[PDB]
Design goal:
Chain lengths: 38, 111, 94, 141, 136, 176
RNA sequence: AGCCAGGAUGUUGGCUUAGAAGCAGCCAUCAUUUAAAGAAAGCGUAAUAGCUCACUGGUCGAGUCGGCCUGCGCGGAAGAU
C-alpha cells in the first residue's frame, strides 16, 4: 500500500476509516488504492 | 543474451545544470570567456552543453575549460559565480542561457 | 417586500464597529431627502441570507427600527476582504 | 430472446460465398459446420436476390448443425444501395456531407419481414431514421 | 513568463507587504480565484497556475490576469562577501495582500470553474479561495 | 441508535437470566454468557428484549447497538446455530477431521493439525470442503479465520482455503 | 442506506475500418418501445461476452445529504553521550 501525508477517495468503492490515531483508506475493489498516515 | 548485450541505448539526456552568461571576457586560447552565474544544478567539465538564445539553440558543444578566477575548478554549483569558455564559439551575447546535460545509457534487453 | 430588523447605534467610530463584528452584527447608514443620516446596526446572518438573492440589490427594502417602516434602496456594500462576510452597507431613502 | 450458450451474429455480406480471408475460422469456435452454412442460408436468402449484409442467431445445444431461421438486416446497410454514398464520413460536422429525404428510406424501412418496437406505424418511421444522421447528414423531413 | 518590457529603474528596495488589498470583486469575468494568505507570487508561479487552469478547460471562454509582478528582486550568489553593492535580478514578484483576486474566468460552467482554480491553487504558495461575481 | 431502538425477540424455550451486566443466554444448541460494557442498560419484558443508553456516558447510543447485535446473534446462535463453509482449491489439497482436531494438508512438508476450542464441531462431506458449526458467532468467525490464516489464496489461479460467500478475483501472468 | 428485480431499442451504431458489437481509436451525442435503462459507467475477452453500475419498480417506514461560519484537536512529525 502507498503511504503519504494526504489521502483522498480515488473511486466509489474506496472507504475512509479511522484506526488508532491514524486515518486509512480501505478499498475492496482495487488494493492499489490502500493508503496510510492520512 | 549475446544479442541483448549488443545493444547500446542511453535513454537519459537530463540537464546537469543550467547557467546564464554575462559580462564576456577575452582569452587568447579559446578566444572568449563568458562569465556565468549558475541558476540551477551543478556544472561539470566533460559533460556536453547546449547553448541557446531566445529558446532556440544558437550553438552546441562540449565544454573544454571550466574556470572560475585562477582556480580552474572542474565543478561549479548553483548560485556561485562561475566562468566558462569553449573553442569554435565566436559570438557571446548577454541574456542567453547555456544548458549542460549529462549523458547516461539505460541499456537494452531482447524480447 | 424585504423586511429587515434594525436598531439605532449608540456609539460611533471603528472601536464600536469592530466590537459589533465579534458579536455577529455590523454598522450601516440610511440617508437621502430632507431627513438626516441615521446610524443603523443589522444582523450578519439575517442580511447574508437575503443578499444571496439578486432581488435584494434591485427591489426596494423596508427596514423596521423602533416600530417604524422606512423604505430604502441598496447603494453600496463593503464586503469583507477574503471571507464571505460584510463590513458596512449604504442605504438610500426611496 | 431466450438465454446465453451460443447466440452470435457476424457476417460480411449476403452476396458473398463465405470465403476464408474476410471471415473464415475467425467467425469463432463452435463445432457447427462452416460448409453447412452454405445450405440453409442458400435455401431462403439466395432464392430471389442478395443485396445487403444480414446477421442471425445460432440456437444450438446437442444436435449436429445449426437449426436457426434467418431474420432482417440492419438499417445501416440500407444507407448504401437504396439511399446514397456507401461510407464518405471524412469530417461529418465540418460540412453538411450528404442528405436523405422523407420519401427516401420510408418504404425501404418497412421491408423488414417480422420485427418491430411498438404497434404504431408513425413511431417506426422515425425509429429506423435513427441510424441515419449518425454519419452527420442533414434532415429535410 | 510575466515581466516588465521596460522600467525607469533597474532595481527596487525590499519594502513591505503591509496593508490590505483593493479589488474585492471580479469586474471583468464571472468567476475567479482570491488570495486568502499573505506573501508574494513569482513569474514562474504566476505562469505555472495559468497553464493548469487552461489545460483542464482545453480551449474555451477567457482568462484574465488581475496581478502582475512589477517588482525587481535581487539575490546574492554563493562564495561572495556581504556588501560590495547590491545583487542581480534573478526573478520578478508581485506583493499580494488579503483580498487580491489572482485569476478570473468567464464562459464556462461553475463545476469546471472549481476544478480549474483548484488545480491552479495547488501551484500557488499562499492560501486561496473561490469567488463569484457579486452584483453592485 | 437505529439498531438499538429495535426490540430483539427471543423464541420459545430461550431462557434469559440477567444477574447484572453479564447476560446468560441458553436454548436448544449450547449456552453462552457475555459481559456488557456497563455504558448500556438492557430491559427484559414479555417475549422480547430492549436496549438503550444510560446517563453520564459520552458514547451512549453507539454501545447499545452492539449490545443488541451481540445478544441478537446469541439468540440465533443458541437456537438455530451458525455455519461457516470453507472449501479448499487446487492440486494436493485435502481436508479431514479426527475427533475435536482437524487434520489439513495444504501442500506443506508436514500435516497441519488445528485444535477446535469451545464446543465448535465440524465435518468434511467432501475432501476439498470443510463445514464448521457452532453456537457462537464470535468463535465460528475466529476459527474460520485460523484455517484461512494457514494458506491465504494467491489470485493468479485461486488455490487454497476460501469462504463459501467469498469471491477470489484472479489476474493474468503478464508477458515473458 | 440495505435487501428482492429490471438493465433495453434504432443498434453488431455509419465509420481514414485487417477485427470493433460502448471502451486508447471516428464523430455527433441525436432517435424508438417503455415502470425506468447511456451510440454510455468497468474487472476486462479470439469476437459473441460472462457479470456489475448510472437510472427505475417492490420491500422496509422517519429522518436523511454536504456546502458555509467558527472553538479545541488529529496525521503530515526522522539524528546522532
Amino acid at each position: 500500500m502507498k503511504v503519504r501525508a494526504s489521502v483522498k477517495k480515488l473511486c466509489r468503492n474506496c472507504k475512509i476509516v479511522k484506526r488508532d490515531g491514524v486515518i486509512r483508506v480501505i478499498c475492496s475493489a482495487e488494493p492499489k488504492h490502500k493508503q496510510r498516515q492520512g | 543474451a549475446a544479442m541483448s548485450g549488443m545493444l547500446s541505448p542511453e535513454l537519459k539526456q537530463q540537464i546537469i545544470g543550467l547557467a546564464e552568461v554575462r559580462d564576456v571576457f577575452k582569452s587568447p586560447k579559446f578566444g572568449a570567456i563568458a562569465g556565468c552565474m549558475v541558476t540551477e544544478g551543478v556544472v561539470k567539465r566533460h559533460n556536453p552543453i547546449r547553448v541557446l538564445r531566445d529558446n532556440v539553440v544558437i550553438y552546441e558543444g562540449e565544454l573544454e575549460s571550466l574556470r572560475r578566477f585562477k582556480d580552474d575548478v572542474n565543478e561549479v554549483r548553483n548560485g556561485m559565480e562561475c566562468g566558462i569558455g569553449v573553442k569554435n564559439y565566436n559570438d557571446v551575447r548577454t541574456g542567453d542561457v547555456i544548458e549542460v546535460f549529462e549523458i547516461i545509457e539505460i541499456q537494452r534487453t531482447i524480447a | 417586500m424585504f423586511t429587515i430588523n434594525a436598531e439605532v447605534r449608540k456609539e460611533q467610530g471603528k472601536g464600536a464597529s469592530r466590537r459589533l463584528r465579534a458579536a455577529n452584527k455590523f454598522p450601516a447608514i440610511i440617508y437621502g431627502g430632507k431627513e438626516a443620516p441615521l446610524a443603523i446596526e443589522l444582523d450578519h446572518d439575517k442580511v447574508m441570507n437575503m443578499q444571496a438573492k439578486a432581488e435584494f440589490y434591485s427591489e426596494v427594502l423596508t427596514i423596521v427600527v423602533d416600530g417604524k417602516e422606512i423604505k430604502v434602496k441598496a447603494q453600496d456594500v463593503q464586503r469583507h476582504p477574503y471571507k464571505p462576510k460584510l463590513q458596512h452597507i449604504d442605504f438610500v431613502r426611496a | 430472446a431466450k438465454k446465453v450458450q451460443a447466440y452470435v451474429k457476424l457476417q460480411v455480406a449476403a452476396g458473398m460465398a463465405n470465403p476464408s480471408p474476410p471471415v473464415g475460422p475467425a467467425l469463432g469456435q463452435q463445432g457447427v459446420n462452416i460448409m453447412e452454412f452454405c445450405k440453409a442460408f442458400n435455401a431462403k436468402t439466395d432464392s430471389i436476390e442478395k443485396g445487403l449484409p444480414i446477421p442471425v442467431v445460432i440456437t444450438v445445444y446437442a444436435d449436429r448443425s445449426f437449426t436457426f431461421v434467418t431474420k432482417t438486416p440492419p438499417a445501416a446497410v440500407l444507407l448504401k444501395k437504396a439511399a446514397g454514398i456507401k461510407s464518405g464520413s471524412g469530417k461529418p460536422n465540418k460540412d453538411k456531407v450528404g442528405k436523405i429525404s422523407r420519401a427516401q428510406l420510408q418504404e425501404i424501412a418497412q421491408t423488414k419481414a417480422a420485427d418491430m418496437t411498438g404497434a404504431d406505424i408513425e413511431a417506426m418511421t422515425r425509429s429506423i431514421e435513427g441510424t441515419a444522421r449518425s454519419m452527420g447528414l442533414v434532415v429535410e423531413d | 513568463m510575466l515581466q516588465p518590457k521596460r522600467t525607469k529603474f533597474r532595481k527596487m528596495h525590499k519594502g513591505r507587504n503591509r496593508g490590505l488589498a483593493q479589488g474585492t470583486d471580479v469586474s471583468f469575468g464571472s468567476f475567479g480565484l482570491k488570495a486568502v494568505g499573505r506573501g508574494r507570487l513569482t513569474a514562474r508561479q504566476i505562469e505555472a497556475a495559468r497553464r493548469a487552469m487552461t489545460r483542464a478547460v482545453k480551449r474555451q471562454g477567457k482568462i484574465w490576469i488581475r496581478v502582475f509582478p512589477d517588482k525587481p528582486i535581487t539575490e546574492k550568489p554563493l562564495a561572495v562577501r556581504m556588501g560590495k553593492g547590491k545583487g542581480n535580478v534573478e526573478y520578478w514578484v508581485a506583493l499580494i495582500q488579503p483580498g487580491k483576486v489572482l485569476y478570473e474566468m468567464d464562459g464556462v460552467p461553475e463545476e469546471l470553474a472549481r476544478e480549474a482554480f483548484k488545480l491552479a491553487a495547488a501551484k500557488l504558495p499562499i492560501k486561496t479561495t473561490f469567488v463569484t461575481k457579486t452584483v453592485m | 441508535s437505529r439498531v438499538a431502538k429495535a426490540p430483539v425477540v427471543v423464541p420459545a424455550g430461550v431462557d434469559v437470566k440477567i444477574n447484572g451486566q453479564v447476560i446468560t443466554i441458553k436454548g436448544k444448541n449450547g449456552e453462552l454468557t457475555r459481559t456488557l460494557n456497563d455504558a448500556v442498560e438492557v430491559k427484559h419484558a414479555d417475549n422480547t428484549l430492549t436496549f438503550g443508553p444510560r446517563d453520564g456516558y459520552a458514547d451512549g447510543w453507539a454501545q447499545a447497538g452492539t449490545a443488541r447485535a451481540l445478544l441478537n446473534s446469541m439468540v440465533i446462535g443458541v437456537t438455530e446455530g451458525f455455519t461457516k463453509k470453507l472449501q479448499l482449491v487446487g492440486v494436493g489439497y485435502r481436508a479431514a477431521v479426527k475427533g475435536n482436531v482437524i487434520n489439513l494438508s495444504l501442500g506443506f512438508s508436514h500435516p497441519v493439525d488445528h485444535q477446535l476450542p469451545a464446543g465448535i464441531t465440524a465435518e468434511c462431506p467432501t475432501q476439498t470442503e470443510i463445514v464448521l458449526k457452532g453456537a457462537d458467532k464470535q468463535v465460528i468467525g475466529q476459527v474460520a479465520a485460523d484455517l484461512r490464516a494457514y494458506r491465504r489464496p494467491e489470485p493468479y489461479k485461486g488455490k487454497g482455503v476460501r469462504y463459501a460467500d467469498e469471491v477470489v478475483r484472479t489476474k493474468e501472468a503478464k508477458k515473458k
